[PDB]
Each structure stands twice: as C-alpha cells, then as structure tokens.
Amino acid sequence: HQAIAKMRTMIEGFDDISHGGLPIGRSTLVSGTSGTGKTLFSIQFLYNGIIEFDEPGVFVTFEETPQDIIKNARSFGWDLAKLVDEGKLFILDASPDPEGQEVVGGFDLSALIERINYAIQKYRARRVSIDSVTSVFQQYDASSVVRRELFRLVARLKQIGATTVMTTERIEEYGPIARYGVEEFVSDNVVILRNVLEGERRRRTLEILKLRGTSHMKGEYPFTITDHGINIFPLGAMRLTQRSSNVRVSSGVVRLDEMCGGGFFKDSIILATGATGTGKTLLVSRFVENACANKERAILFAYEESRAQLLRNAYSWGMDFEEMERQNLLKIVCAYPESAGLEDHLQIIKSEINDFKPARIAIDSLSALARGVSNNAFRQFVIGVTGYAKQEEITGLFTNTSDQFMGADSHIEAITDTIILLQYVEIRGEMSRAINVFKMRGSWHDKAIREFMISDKGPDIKD
Amino acid sequence: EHQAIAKMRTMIEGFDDISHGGLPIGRSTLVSGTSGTGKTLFSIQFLYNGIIEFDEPGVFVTFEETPQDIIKNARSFGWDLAKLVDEGKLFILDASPDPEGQEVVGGFDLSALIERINYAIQKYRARRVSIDSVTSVFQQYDASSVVRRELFRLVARLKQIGATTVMTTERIEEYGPIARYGVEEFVSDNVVILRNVLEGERRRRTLEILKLRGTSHMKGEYPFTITDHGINIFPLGAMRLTQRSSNVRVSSGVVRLDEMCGGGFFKDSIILATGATGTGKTLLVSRFVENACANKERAILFAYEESRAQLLRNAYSWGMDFEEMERQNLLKIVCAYPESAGLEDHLQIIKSEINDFKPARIAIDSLSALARGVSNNAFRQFVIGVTGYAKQEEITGLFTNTSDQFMGAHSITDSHIEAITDTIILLQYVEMSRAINVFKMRGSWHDKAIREFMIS
Amino acid sequence: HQAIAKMRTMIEGFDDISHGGLPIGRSTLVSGTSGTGKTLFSIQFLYNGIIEFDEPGVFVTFEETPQDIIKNARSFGWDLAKLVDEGKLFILDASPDPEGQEVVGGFDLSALIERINYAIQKYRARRVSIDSVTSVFQQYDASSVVRRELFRLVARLKQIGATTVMTTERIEEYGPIARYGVEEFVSDNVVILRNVLEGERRRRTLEILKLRGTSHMKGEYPFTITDHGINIFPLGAMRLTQRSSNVRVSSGVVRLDEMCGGGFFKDSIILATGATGTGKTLLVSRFVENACANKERAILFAYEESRAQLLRNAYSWGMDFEEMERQNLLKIVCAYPESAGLEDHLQIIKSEINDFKPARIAIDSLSALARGVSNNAFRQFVIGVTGYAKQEEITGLFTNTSHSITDSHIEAITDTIILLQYVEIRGEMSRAINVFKMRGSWHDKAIREFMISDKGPDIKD
Ligand SMILES: Nc1ncnc2c1ncn2[C@@H]1O[C@H](COP(=O)(O)OP(=O)(O)OP(=O)(O)O)[C@@H](O)[C@H]1O
Ligand SMILES: Nc1ncnc2c1ncn2[C@@H]1O[C@H](COP(=O)(O)OP(=O)(O)OP(=O)(O)O)[C@@H](O)[C@H]1O
Ligand SMILES: Nc1ncnc2c1ncn2[C@@H]1O[C@H](COP(=O)(O)OP(=O)(O)OP(=O)(O)O)[C@@H](O)[C@H]1O
Ligand SMILES: Nc1ncnc2c1ncn2[C@@H]1O[C@H](COP(=O)(O)OP(=O)(O)OP(=O)(O)O)[C@@H](O)[C@H]1O
Ligand SMILES: Nc1ncnc2c1ncn2[C@@H]1O[C@H](COP(=O)(O)OP(=O)(O)OP(=O)(O)O)[C@@H](O)[C@H]1O
Ligand SMILES: Nc1ncnc2c1ncn2[C@@H]1O[C@H](COP(=O)(O)OP(=O)(O)O)[C@@H](O)[C@H]1O
Ligand SMILES: [Mg+2]
Ligand SMILES: [Mg+2]
Ligand SMILES: [Mg+2]
Ligand SMILES: [Mg+2]
Ligand SMILES: [Mg+2]
Secondary structure: OOOOOEEOOOOOOHHHHOOOOEEOOOEEEEEEOOOOOHHHHHHHHHHHHHHHOOOOEEEEEOOOOHHHHHHHHHHHOOOHHHHHHOOOEEEEEOOOOOOOOOOOOOOOHHHHHHHHHHHHHHOOOOEEEEOOOOOOOOOOOOHHHHHHHHHHHHHHHHHHOOEEEEEEEOOOOOOOOOHHHOOOOOOOEEEEEEEEEEOOEEEEEEEEEEEOOOOOOOOEEEEEEEOOEEEEOOOOOOOOOOOOOOOEEOOOOHHHHHHOOOOEEOOOEEEEEEOOOOOHHHHHHHHHHHHHHOOOOEEEEEOOOOHHHHHHHHHHOOOOHHHHHHOOOEEEEEOOHHHOOHHHHHHHHHHHHHHHOOOEEEEOOOOOOOOOOOHHHHHHHHHHHHHHHHHOOOEEEEEEEOOOOOOOOOOOOOOOOEEEEEEEEEEOOEEEEEEEEEEEOOOOOOOOOEEEEEEOOEEEEOO | OOOOOOEEOOOOOOHHHHOOOOEEOOOEEEEEEOOOOOHHHHHHHHHHHHHHHOOOOEEEEEOOOOHHHHHHHHHHHOOOHHHHHHHOOEEEEEOOOOOOOOOOOOOOOHHHHHHHHHHHHHHOOOOEEEEOOHHHHOOOOHHHOOHHHHHHHHHHHHHHHOOEEEEEOOOOOOOOOOOOOOOHHHHOOEEEEEEEEEEOOEEEEEEEEEOOOOOOOOOOEEEEEEEOOEEEEOOHHHOOOOOOOOOOEEOOOOHHHHHHOOOOEEOOOEEEEEEOOOOOHHHHHHHHHHHHHHOOOOEEEEEOOOOHHHHHHHHHHHOOOHHHHHHOOOEEEEEOOOOOOOHHHHHHHHHHHHHHHOOOEEEEOOHHHOOOOOOHHHHHHHHHHHHHHHHHOOOEEEEEEEOOOOOOOOOOOOOOOOOOOOEEEEEEEEOOEEEEEEEEEOOOOOOOEOEEOOOO | OOOOOEEOOOOEOHHHHOOOOEEOOOEEEEEEOOOOOHHHHHHHHHHHHHHOOOOOEEEEEOOOOHHHHHHHHHHHOOOHHHHHHOOOEEEEEOOOOOOOOOOOOOOOOHHHHHHHHHHHHHOOOOEEEEEOHHHHOOOOOOHHHHHHHHHHHHHHHHHHOOEEEEEEEOOOOOOOOOOOOOHHHOOOEEEEEEEEEEOOEEEEEEEEEEEOOOOOOOOOEEEEEEOOEEEEOOOOOOOOOOOOOOOEEOOOOHHHHHHOOOOEEOOOEEEEEEOOOOOHHHHHHHHHHHHHHOOOOEEEEEOOOOHHHHHHHHHHOOOOHHHHHHOOOEEEEEOOHHHOOHHHHHHHHHHHHHHHOOOEEEEOOOHHHHOOOOHHHHHHHHHHHHHHHHHOOOEEEEEEEOOOHHHHHHHHHOOEEEEEEEEEEOOEEEEEEEEEEEOOOOOOOOOEEEEEEOOEEEEOO
C-alpha cells in the first residue's frame, strides 16, 4: 500500500476533503457555473503555495487582464503585484484584444504550452493554474476534438511535473460535469463547485468527483467566501473524540444548579426549550452573567434582539450587561438570521470564539435560525456548532421553541447533553410557569416539574 | 481586505444594499431577465437617479424602442426625461432602432456603435452608460457563438472609457440559463438577474445578484415591486439588528390594560393582540390609535378586514370621532384589499405611508388578513419586515391576529412570529363574556390574571 | 405622472385587469395554444369598438375566410356581415389561396401593410386586428428575421396611428410565450391566453404579462367563453371580507340566531361544515325558507340532490318549496358538479343572480364541486362567488365537509362558520351544533345538542 504524494493546498477545509491535498504532477479540473468561486480557488491555490511553502507559480489567463486579476485579489489583502515584482508569481496573459479583433485561424495550444513551459522554467514554478480551458475550446467545438486537445495539454503538463489546477465552466447545476462532456474523462482529478438555488437562497458547495489513485471524502460539502477567500466546512472531518470531564459550572441560578445535580457539566451542551415568554432569554442572560461573575469570558449571540434591548431587559432583571462589557468579559453579537446563511453563522460563531476565547457561549434562539431552513441545513449547523464547542471545551447554552400552544423536530436533541424545559401552566384563571430538567447525561437531575416565578431579581424556582 | 473597490451608488431603493454600495466603477454590469421583468426600467432609473442626485450625466443606448417611447414610458413614474435631454444631462443614442425602409444587408458593425457611444460619453461628460437591447446585434452569427467575443470587446472598451455601464440582455425561462446564449455571464464582471416567477396563480418579481468580481454582495433573491416612483427592492437580509430601546411608556388607550402591562406599552415595542373574533380586537386598536391623536401624535390605521365606513361608524358608537382626527391631520386610515397585491406590496405600502406621514404609532387591524393563500415563509418575512422597520423608526406598533380564523386553529401564529413580538395580549371569551390577558410583556412585569376587557 | 391614454378594448373584465384597456396607438400581442379563444378576443376588440362606440375597424385574416369568421361570430349573435355592408367593419383577407400557389414561394409583408394602411384610411379605422400573424412568418426559420419583420410591422402601424391587436401562437401552456421566443421582446403589450389541462378538467386563464408604459393586474385571471363572448373574472379586485352594513338577518333557526349574537350579518358568507348526515342540507333549506317567509327572493343551488328530492325532503321538514316557486320567491337550480367547468358554475350563479335578483343564495354542498377539481381552482371559485355575493348585497350560505392552503384561505374569507357533527354518546347517536366563528360579533362558543324533526332543527340547552 504505497500512497501517492500530494501537494498540500491550504484552502481551509480543502485538505481534509482531498485528504492531504492535490496529487503531485497531476492535473485537477475544477468545474462550475458562473460565479461559483472557480477563479478564486485558482488564485488562492497559487497564493498560498507562494507564501506558505515558498513555491513559485504561474497563473495563465485567457479571459481577464492581469490588472483585474490583481485588483480583485487585493480585496482579500492578496497583494499579487508584490509577488509578481519579487519574481515569485507570474501571470501569463494569453487573453484576446479589442485591437486585432478577429483572426483567420483558431487558438494554438502548441504555442501556449511552449510559453507555459518557458514560464515554469524561468520562475522555477512548481505550482500552476489556468483560468479557463474553454476559452481555447470556444473553437474546436466538436467533442472529439476537445477530448484530444485537452489530453495533449494535460499530458504535456504532466511531463513538466508542475501540479496544475485548470478551470472549466458548466451551465447547469446537477447537470453535466463540464461543457462538451469530454473533459472530465481526461483529467485525473475532478472537483465540482456549485452554487445551488433553492427557494430564494443560494448555497455554495464543493465536491470531489474523483482523484485517480487516491482516496478522498466523497459527496457535497458546504463552503463560503470570507476574509481569506474560500473557507470550506467539511462537516464530518471533525472527530468524535472530544474530552469529557466531571468538572461543573454554575448555570447562574442556584436552585437550578441543585436540580441539575450540582450544576452543569463544563463540557456539556445545554438546550433550553419552551414556550415564548417562559424565560428562555432569562436563563441565557444569567448563564453569561455567571461566567463574568467568575471572571470568565462569554459570548452572547442574539438572533432576535438588538444589543440595546438586551441591555435594557438585563437591567430589569438586575444584570448590568454594560459593566460586564467594560471589563471585557461579556461580548454581545447581534444579527438577524436572514442576514446570512447558516454556514456563515457558523463561521461567525467560530471567528468570535477564536478572537475572544470564551469559556462559555450562548445562542439566544435556534428557532430564529431555523426560519425557512430545511432540516438538513439546520441540522448540519447545529452539529457543527456543538461539535466545535465541545472540541474547544466551551460550555454551550442554546435555546429553542416548544409547541405548547400549537398542535402537531427532536433530531438535535441527540446532540444535546442537558435539556431543560420551560412551560406555561394555567392555574385557576392565572398564567404561571414551570421548569424541569428533562435530560442530564452523566448526572442526577430532578424529575419534578416545579413552579417558578420571574421578577426583577431574575428567575426564582419554588418547591 | 486592503482593497476596497469604489462602487457607484445607483439609488435604486434597496439595490445599493444588495450590491452593498452600488455597481463597481468603470465596469460593466449585465442585467438579464424575461420580458416584463423591468430591465428597461432598471436601465433608465440608473441614469435618471445619477443625473438628479449626483449631477452625473449619462448616455442611454437603444436598440429596440425609440427615444419618444423611452420618454413617454418614463412619464408613468413622473420622470421628465425630455427636460434632461434639453439641458444636456441625458443623451439618448439610437444604436439600431431600425428604419422601416430597411436595406438588404446591415448590422454586423458593433465597432461603429462603440465609437459613437465613446463620442457621446466624451461630449456629455457621461459617467453612467446604460445599454438596452445589447442582444439585438447578437442575432447575427449566433450559431457561431461570436457573441462571447463581441461582448468581450464591447465590455473591454467600456472599461477603457471608464464609464460605469449597465447592459441588458434576454432570457426565455425564469429558472433556465442566465442569458440567451450561455456566454454572457462568463464575459461580464457583474451579473444581476431579474425574474418574474409564475407560481400557483400569481407572478412575483425578484432580484438577485450573482457573479460580482472583486467585491461582496448579498446572495439569493430579494422580492421587489414597481411603484409610481420606479423599482423598489426589499433586501430583508440587509436589515440590521441594531434597533434602539427605552423605558419610555405610551398609553394603550385602555386604563385597565395599562395597569396590566405594568404601566402601559413600551414606546419602541411591538404589540400583538391575538384572540377570537368578536372579542374586541378592533376596539383595542381604535383606542390605541385614538390615544396617539389625543396627545397630538400622528398615527396610521391600516385596515384589510373593514371598509372605511365601518371603521368610522363603529368608532362613533364608542365616542371616537375618527373623522375629526383626520381633519387635524393626526389620523390616517388606509384601507386596502389584502388580496389585490402580494405581501411585498403590502409591505411597500405600509412603508410608503409611514415615510410620508411620519407617525408615532401604527396599527394593523388583522395580520391574519394577509396570512392567507400564502406560505408561512412568505408571511413570516412580511411580519419581520414590518416589525423590524417599525422598531427601526421608533414607531409603536399594534398588530392583531385572529385565533379562530379557520378550523385548524392555534392560539399562536402558525409561522411563530411571537419571538419577534415584544408584548402579547390575548383576547378570549370567559364565564358569556369576554376577557383580556397579558401573555407576554418583554422588558417589564405584567399581570398574569385573566380579567374582563371592559374599556370603561 | 402622465398616464398613457387607453382604448377600452372592451371585453368583460379585461379592462379591469388592464386598468382601463389597451394603450392607444400601440400593438398588443395575444398569444396562446390552439383553442384558447384568440380569434374570439380579436373579434370582440373590433366588434365592441363598432357597436358600443363608433370606431370602425379592420380584421386581417390569414387562417380562415371572411365567410367563416362571420359564420362563427353569428353563434354569439354578432352580425358581422351587416357591419361590413355598412362600411364599419372591413375584413382584409390575407389568407393563402386554398387551391393555387405563388411562384415566389413566400410573401413580403410590405405588400400587406399598405393594404392594411389603405383599408384603415378608407374606413377611418381606429381598431385593427391581425389574426395569426404567425402564418406570415412560417416562411422564416430564423428568429432574427422574425424579429426584424415583426418590429417593422409594429413600427409601421404606429406611424399609421392605429391601435392594434395581433395574435400569435405557442405550443405549450407553461412554455415559451411565443413559439419563436422573440415576439414578446418586440411587442409593447403582451397578453397570454392558456387552456390548461389538469386532473381530468380544463381551465382557461388570461394574463397580462406586461404593458411597457403603464400598470396592470398581475397573475392568472380565469375566464370562460359564453354566448356573449369572453367573460373574465378579475378576482383580485373585489370585497371578500369587507361590508357596507351592520344589520342582521335571521338564519331561519331562532336559537341559532341567538348563538350568533343576533343572527347572521346581512351580506355575510356563512359556511356550515360537518360530517355526512349532520343536517347541512337542513340548514340550507331552512335558510331559503326564511328568506321567502319575509318575501325575499332566494336561489337554492344544488349538487347533491335533484329538484324532486329537495322538494320531498323539504316537505318532510315542513317546508313547501313548490309554493315558494309559485310565488316567484324561491328558485331551484340543480346540476351535477361534473356538468360544468368550475368557472361555469360561477358563471351560472352569477347569471341566475342577475336575472332573479335574490336577497340570498345557498349552496347545498361545496364539497360536491371540490371533489373533481384542483386545489387552486376551488379556492378561486369560492373567492369568485363570495366576491359577487357581497357586490350584490346577497347573504350566502354555503356548506362543506369536515393544514392545507386551500381550506385555510376559504375558511378565512368566510365570515361565519358553523360546525355540525354526528357522534356516538352512551351507545346512541347524537347531534351537535357549534358556532366556530362569527366575524365581528359576540357569539356563544359552546357546543349545543340538537335534534332534527319534521319541524326543522331544534337546538337544546
Ligand atoms: N472581499 C470579499 N468578501 C466577500 N465575498 C467576496 C469578496 N470578494 C469576492 N467575493 C465573492 O467571491 C466570488 C468570486 O467570484 P469568482 O472569481 O469565483 O467568479 P467566477 O465564478 O470564476 O466567474 P466565471 O463564472 O465567469 O468563471 C464573487 O462572486 C463574490 O461574491
Ligand atoms: N421586571 C420584571 N418583573 C416581572 N416580570 C418580568 C420582568 N421583566 C421581564 N419579566 C417577565 O419575564 C419574561 C421573559 O420572557 P422571555 O424573553 O423569556 O420570553 P421567551 O420565551 O424568550 O419568548 P421569545 O423567545 O419569543 O422572546 C417576560 O414574559 C416578562 O413577563
Ligand atoms: N406606474 C407603474 N406602476 C406599476 N407598474 C408599472 C408602472 N409603469 C410600468 N409598470 C410595469 O413595469 C413593467 C415595465 O418594465 P419593462 O417591461 O420596461 O422591462 P422590459 O421592457 O420587460 O424589458 P423588455 O424591454 O425586454 O421587455 C411593465 O410590464 C409594467 O408592469
Ligand atoms: N358560441 C360559443 N359558445 C361557447 N363556446 C364557444 C362558442 N364559440 C366558440 N367557442 C369555443 O371557442 C373555442 C375556439 O376559440 P377561438 O376560435 O377564439 O380560438 P382559435 O383562435 O380558433 O384558436 P386556434 O387558432 O388554436 O384554433 C372552441 O374550442 C369553442 O369551444
Ligand atoms: N322527517 C325526518 N325526521 C327525522 N329526521 C330526519 C327527517 N328527515 C331527515 N332526517 C335526518 O336528517 C339527516 C340528513 O340531514 P340533511 O338532509 O338536512 O343534510 P345531510 O343529509 O346531513 O347532508 P349530507 O347528505 O350531504 O350529509 C338524516 O341523517 C336524517 O336522519
Ligand atoms: N363593548 C364592547 N366591549 C368589548 N368588545 C366589543 C364591544 N363592542 C363590540 N366589541 C367587539 O370589538 C370587535 C372589533 O372587531 P374584531 O373583534 O376585531 O372582529 P374580528 O376579530 O373578527 O376582526 C367587534 O367585532 C365587536 O364584537
Ligand atoms: Mg472566473
Ligand atoms: Mg426570548
Ligand atoms: Mg376586527
Ligand atoms: Mg384562430
Ligand atoms: Mg347534504
């Protein structure tokens, strides 16, 4: 069992799906529709190679000028002009001009490969890419001709030895792998970038169709475009090896801690589900407050309420959130669910965690995030967040909405370690409330369903 | 992050939020869609706004309609394009509006058109260019796919000139190829899709931005409508969760209720009055609206389930002179048929009336009047748009909901909008008689008891 | 804000949808599949201009002959031959010779547009209609040529200054707007006529896709073709829940009136739903009896039962339906749901109302109509009926059988809902009635036991 050597491509998450990067000396065909990030993948591949591994490279372009390639890259802070000046990056301009608008013949790949070979030797390139192969095959439309011409191109690049990422377009999502349907059978490594429209939403995903001679994660995985270009989330690449101790932390409510058998486990995920107005946001406020009381950092993620309202509600319950922010212990992040896809909310949660390094986090509402979201997309989000929170040993508190007043869902409860239910009880013409610890993995919990009140001192559970 | 491309604002309401600053400067934008999606309107409104808002002159290029039709059609929005032409701010160039006394062979001359456009730009010092019917010259040698190369050259030349250009193209199918020839979206740097989707028995217009190079944008489709002022887009995801809050109280108009709410409503709250029909939900709304006017505040009463005549007639019975409050320009009553337009139009109407009247308070006689014949997703988005906007503008909002509207009744909204609502009031039957109860009072304490809803 | 001037281009319901008719001096393209009523639309455009106003017109035909056009028009009572003799209507026959052929193969439109122009001047036409302009383009398989020539045709008609309707054709109902995929990008105003087959039933709808210079209603508006031509239902422009008055009328049952807080609201829509055998028919029969008791006219529409059976069942319940017909107060209209398209049941209700001028109508069963139709068709039917019932100040009592989008919508627009159930209690069957909803009023909200006798419903406490 001799593994094939790979060239690591530090596009976050890609090296996990490709399971070690792209095979060395092989061509990779990246296909997708317009606006799927195909041109970003190509730049990011060369850029990372040049700065991380000091590997010179060549970007061949047919449909853009070097000036826009650089200008667009600069939106990511990727100063490609600098890398060009230093002789690390070379952009090979093979684009058509408005000057000399048309020619008598067609594109010459023999001339092209000679220029690429030269550029590779001159800059000692090991890593190369092509923005559009079809820009050549705008002529030579016969599928039998395209197959041969692509074969020749790939074979020559293989002899040179540079690892190549070449790009092609397709028209339809879930349609043919590539235009003419004779390209994907020539290339050794094929990657699909799609941007699926469902309902009114677009979702970017990445899939590796095949890698000849090597293993890879199979199927479709989500990705987004963020501060450093492409950021892929290979859900399932994380391991189910998270630590689990008997260390406990206070919930912020003394009687609840007793009902929980002495407090929440530090490494647990807690879900507080109940009817609207039963105090879900009260327990969340006390959860992050307790962290700060013990000089621990905590992040409150609000998907319903603005910061101004959270501060006001907290004051009415005796909690000075503004003071906790002044001490740099509490941080509040507010957004509408509709502002971003769930894969971005996941990136936001992770980024805020990496920067603030909290002991605890809380999500004010999962039901806010699930609005208009399919069970698959929502479920993946919840798994990703709780998986990460466990991995980093961050105590996590999430809330949700129960169907108490609605007739006629529990697919994330298998992830949650502790479940607390908040419900209304109508007693003799008055509304009241009751709390119960429904589930508690690893510990005793009170089976009783107990009445509680909410006042300006916060929740107060009675026996 | 070092680079921040300088984008040019279009001032097409909502567009600048989806594009997040407008269109990239000196670059072409491709706008595709089927007939009736508003391509031409977008193309005109772009130049029109530039001219009047930023004093930025521009050139409109036409292959299909004559300058006279462009001008006449613009008048339906009150846009005097003839005036702008006389002043020299707007120039309409005839590219290929063809004469009837046609020759045998013609067209096949995009280079000549580019020279003419360049000239017009230089003469009128244009900063904005808008090209309708760019496919009118792609009807030639289409079978050879020369379109990709011809479009490439046109786009490249426009960049050299430096003017920002909006180009339109054609589609056949709403969810089919981005453009007729399958090449335009690969040549263009910026792609905007205008759809007019027929589903069920209704059409809905939506706008999407795809394929922007070098910059960011919102993704997916956002509903839009066409009003008497042109295109109006509602980018719900652009709404920030940064609304203000305060402990300022406003009276509900009902004394007992103010006590049950712990001292009236919070000024910047959203109140949802949910209950059985006949429990006085519209009585509570009438008092809410009255109180605003009693204190010389402006208020808008939106209605779907009542004719204007009933609102005034029933108000008189109690002792509320709605006509007088209108005479003083404190009260505005806006009656509409809930099914004459889509939810995105009802939202646009609500916003428009608020923008012009500048109310302290608004009320909706029945949200459930709009929550029918539509999906829960469509309705929920409507509610978020209304509540979000009302809070952003610091407008006290009282909306109602009927709990027994249909046999599949629930005591809470089917789409779960109660998480958005800050105060919830239930109206039910008791004893024979009727009662009011504060279910939720976010930010304060409230009376948990259920008691009679006796206004006086 | 200067609105574009419009010609009424009267077609019942059309000018509500188009917000005042068709733009003057511009070409409107009407596209559809075979048998969608395109020719009929074209005839009414010119016919009405001539009869309702005094606007001469030219009908240009390609597919059939003037003789066939006239004969078909006569089925609607439209005497087109007379209008031709008077010099008001002119039919320009551009149809190819059935026997012969031309040595040039094709045909130049420049040879026709002048004949149209000449005819317009000669007859001082204001309205021009071209039926199957497609047949003039059958010679061209190049869509770029079709645009070139169609644009030319439209532009020349504008110079002439005539308002015109061109018809074209498509193959699919939900496919391309026109068969070449270009015409809708040339014409200024586009209207689509489709005839959709679904669930072993077929529907006609009209849509205005666009009007370049103005506004219109959007979406599909169902229509039917009757003895008087095209009749369109502008369902999006009616009062479904709004009312002008606040006065009650008796339901026919005294205790039920009390449960409803003083009776039904006049001009309200009452929906009585329940299990089979619960007494839905009984309340309907009692309702129309009350109308006639007060000398009000009522129409009982029936789908479950024949007239003979309705009279007999009513007689057993103490109601002489035959006497009420003799007094010209009651009318009974019996048909199977399957006997007509759902839009035609609407047209029948509408027509019977227009002639009989009822104070009340009732439908013995809506489920009878729902069972053979799609969910969208049924929702629109109810909207249409409730729209007209309120327009004419008619109290309507409909019944049905005991979430979906269709039923939530229908029940939502309904003002009053009464639930009837037949259940087992203590080893015997027992009946109960409940007022589920009573819009705008106090109501009991308590389930009451009742019995059915030969004296009608008897609600107990
Ligand atoms: N600074 C940024 N922040 C956020 N998103 C960005 C940023 N820069 C670019 N993007 C997104 O990344 C995408 C990059 O597009 P890309 O270069 O992949 O085009 P493409 O799909 O290759 O074009 P074609 O389909 O013609 O090949 C853009 O559509 C844009 O939405
Ligand atoms: N100062 C106070 N005194 C007494 N009760 C209060 C006070 N402040 C808040 N409350 C009560 O505490 C409750 C907190 O509501 P909470 O935000 O937990 O509802 P929720 O279940 O989260 O609903 P949603 O998820 O829709 O926001 C309020 O319903 C309110 O009645
Ligand atoms: N005052 C108005 N109020 C509401 N809607 C209007 C008004 N004026 C025009 N419209 C609508 O706007 C649409 C016009 O957009 P437009 O049709 O010009 O784009 P487009 O012309 O379809 O592109 P193409 O030129 O290929 O047809 C019309 O179909 C009409 O429905
Ligand atoms: N007097 C009438 N009563 C009821 N229906 C009628 C009457 N006359 C015609 N129709 C209906 O109209 C339909 C034909 O309409 P019309 O002639 O307007 O369409 P068309 O232009 O012939 O369509 P195509 O060009 O595809 O044949 C027939 O299917 C017929 O059922
Ligand atoms: N003379 C009568 N005496 C007692 N009960 C009667 C008499 N006539 C009819 N009924 C009862 O009335 C019931 C039928 O009610 P009705 O005909 O008013 O509507 P329905 O039959 O419930 O409607 P559907 O048949 O659609 O369910 C029968 O179950 C029968 O027992
Ligand atoms: N004195 C009163 N006290 C309380 N409620 C009343 C009084 N008089 C009338 N009402 C109710 O106030 C209601 C306002 O309309 P509403 O209940 O909203 O109807 P719907 O809920 O069906 O839209 C009226 O329907 C009426 O029944
Ligand atoms: Mg690209
Ligand atoms: Mg909450
Ligand atoms: Mg009301
Ligand atoms: Mg015909
Ligand atoms: Mg029956």
